[PDB]
Amino acid sequence: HHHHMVHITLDPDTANPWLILSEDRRQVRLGDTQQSIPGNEERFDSYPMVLGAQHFHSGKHYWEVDVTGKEAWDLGVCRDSVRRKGHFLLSSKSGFWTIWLWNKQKYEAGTYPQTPLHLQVPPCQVGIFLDYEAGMVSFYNITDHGSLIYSFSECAFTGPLRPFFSPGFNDGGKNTAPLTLCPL
């Protein structure tokens, strides 16, 4: 899957305004306050969420994310069509294919309802693989020899798809650290 590597740039036009993106659009973290930026149609308004600029219409695509020091986060892909504005449940039923950590050490897949995961090694790095034609998205524990964390299959897929990130909420005080997309 390593050879299907893709270079992803976070899109500030989708970014929830509490989010702070590094200049190179390779890092995202949650600010202590809220940016003043357009209320445009792509912007996630309710939750600290951001997409990659990239759209996947076909083919196989792979990337990695550092989560070192983080008590919560959310990673995966979603339909370009997913709703941006207002409250919703993160799941395949809303057109997102994600896993997450919340409340330090509780890992779960975004099934409806959510599936708790039994991991042997807390991941410091997460790999995300998309096979469009096979309607598949899978999550590997880079820290544990690239062991499969979880796989969504028979996803079908018709629209364009988007990479998806949240550095999580900081209700904790201790989730300040950013997500980082690893150079590969």
Ligand X SMILES: CNC(=O)[C@H](Cc1ccncc1)NC(=O)[C@@H]1C[C@@H](C2CCCCC2)CN1C(=O)C[C@H](N)c1ccccc1OC
Question: Interface residues with ligand X (CB under 6 A)?
Answer: 47-48, 74, 87-90, 100, 102, 166, 168-169
Comparison of 16 and 132: residue with beta carbon closer to ligand X: 16
Task: Report the residue number, 47 or 136, with the smaller CB distance to ligand X.
Answer: 47
Tell me how far, at minimum, the Cβ of 136 lies from ligand X, in Å: 21
Q: Around 15, how many Cα atoms within 13 Å sit in the side-chain half-sphere?
A: 25
Q: How far is the CB of 133 from ligand X (least distance, A)?
A: 28
Which one, 146 or 151, has the nearer CB to ligand X? 151
| Closest distance to ligand X from the beta carbon of 65 (Å) | 14
Closest to ligand X by CB, 88 or 135: 88
